[PDB]
Ligand binder design. Structure first.
Ligand SMILES: [Mn+2]
Ligand SMILES: [Mn+2]
Lengths: 41, 293
């Protein structure tokens, strides 16, 4: 097994359970109209 | 590695009757993979982006539809782009699609962004066409090089602290944004947990809270989940992809979440439109639609 493969496997297993313990020590609108790219269809 | 040459050859087939291949050399593609991979790792796994920005959902190897979207929205770097993942599988030209996207990431690394979708994962794209395309047109070693590059893609993005973007959706494990930042790369997609969910979860109108997902992985989540999430993090909108929708885009929970799907006539099995969402500097969002044949 390559080192990259070993690291990827280690990280994959770590990433399965990301602890919620993360301790440190303009407004959206929508236009009214959709633009059609290919009206000839 | 001559990047402008590569992009020139990829764009050359624009206007050709859809389906004409571009055959870059194996070394050129390997170069794209290795250089974009370096760039992905040098940038945050949770991107923080500013408008104006154009956002696209699943492309799934529909190269000529990608070119139509770029043609209307403006080819990089005319406009800034964020893609939400699922570049490969199902379509006939995954290779041209991912090569052009990676080329633009390398050429304009501060103005062009790609998130990871659930198909940017060897165990999925082994089965749904990308492995086959690589084996046919190149070799399986190039496929493994793509996998190593996919394993470094960022996972989510926040636009102007108001629009949370990811491929699938929310996770019952997602309590703080900092948790996404703890995810380590390179990585495969685990079969459960925060990373899995961000790539695999779906909204569902009939579920209060969290439900089972018919996909057989991750969860579904209801309108109330979306609302409490937006409120807690002072966000206005979730923007995700991952599911084909008739009109190309589709709202959920009274416009608090939008699904974007950019590949029209998906798989030649659905009659959906594709859509891209443009976000201007005031965060006014509009939709540009590719209607089905
Ligand atoms: Mn997906
Ligand atoms: Mn998809």
């Amino acid at each position: 097994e390559t080192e990259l493969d070993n690291l990827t496997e280690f990280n994959t297993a770590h990433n399965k359970r990301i602890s919620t313990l993360t301790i440190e020590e303009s407004r959206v609108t929508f236009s009214e109209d959709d633009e059609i790219i290919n009206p000839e269809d | 590695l001559n990047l402008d040459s590569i992009i020139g050859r990829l764009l050359e087939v624009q206007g050709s009757r859809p389906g004409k291949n571009v055959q870059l050399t194996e070394n050129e593609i390997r170069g794209l993979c290795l250089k974009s991979r370096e760039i992905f790792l040098s940038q945050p796994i949770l991107l923080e982006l500013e408008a104006p920005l154009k956002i696209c959902g699943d492309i799934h190897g529909q190269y000529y539809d990608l070119l139509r979207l770029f043609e209307y929205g403006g080819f990089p770097p005319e406009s800034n782009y964020l893609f939400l993942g699922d570049y490969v599988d199902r379509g006939k030209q995954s290779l041209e699609t991912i090569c052009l996207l990676l080329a633009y990431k390398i050429k304009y690394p501060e103005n062009f962004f790609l998130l990871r979708g659930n198909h940017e994962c060897a165990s999925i794209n082994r089965i749904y066409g990308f492995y086959d395309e690589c084996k046919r047109r190149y070799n399986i070693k190039l496929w493994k090089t793509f996998t190593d590059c996919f394993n470094c893609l960022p996972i989510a993005a926040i636009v102007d602290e108001k629009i949370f973007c990811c491929h699938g959706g929310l996770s019952p494990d997602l309590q703080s944004m900092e948790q996404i930042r703890r995810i380590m790369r390179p990585t495969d997609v685990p079969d459960q947990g925060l990373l899995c969910d961000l790539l695999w979860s779906d909204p569902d109108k009939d579920v209060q809270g969290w439900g089972e997902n018919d996909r057989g992985v991750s969860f579904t989540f209801g309108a109330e989940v979306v609302a409490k999430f937006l409120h807690k993090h002072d966000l206005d909108l979730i923007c995700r992809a991952h599911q084909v929708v008739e009109d190309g885009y589709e709202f959920f929970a009274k416009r608090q979440l939008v699904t974007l799907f950019s590949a029209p006539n998906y798989c030649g099995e659905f009659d959906n439109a594709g859509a891209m969402m443009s976000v201007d500097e005031t965060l006014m969002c509009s939709f540009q639609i590719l209607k089905p044949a």
